[PDB]
Amino acid sequence: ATQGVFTLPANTRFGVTAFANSSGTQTVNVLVNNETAATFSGQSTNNAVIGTQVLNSGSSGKVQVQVSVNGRPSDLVSAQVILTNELNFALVGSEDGTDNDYNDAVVVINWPLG
Ligand SMILES: *C(=O)C[C@@H]1O[C@@H](C)[C@@H](O)[C@@H](O)[C@@H]1O
Ligand SMILES: [Ca+2]
Ligand SMILES: [Ca+2]
Hints:
mainly beta, Jelly Rolls, five-stranded antiparallel β-sheet, 10 strands, binds 3,7-anhydro-2,8-dideoxy-L-glycero-D-gluco-octonic acid, binds calcium ion, sugar binding protein, Lectin, Fucosylated, Dendrimer, Second Generation
């Protein structure tokens, strides 16, 4: 199934933050309505934050996370969780290799802000 694609409410600010846990430099691209809105890159095996940013979901609300390592797309896992009918999380893990820890880039999107 498709992973890493989330429909947000339109015209709403949201946060996106990426963490790395791999020997490989992770590149995380965040598309809003199919156009690049942020791109983060970095290397850590210690959960370093490789980027954090506030972005607007725009007219479509469509947000897609892509993760690439060594020029190759990583395998993605994702889900969304909503607490008290108000606080939203879109969660992505990714695997760049064969150990299947799925933490090589971890991406957390949260809304609403403010
Ligand atoms: C080896 O390069 C694989 C790669 O880096 C490891 C240190 C570990 O984080 C593994 O999950 C990652 O796929
Ligand atoms: Ca891995
Ligand atoms: Ca890892």
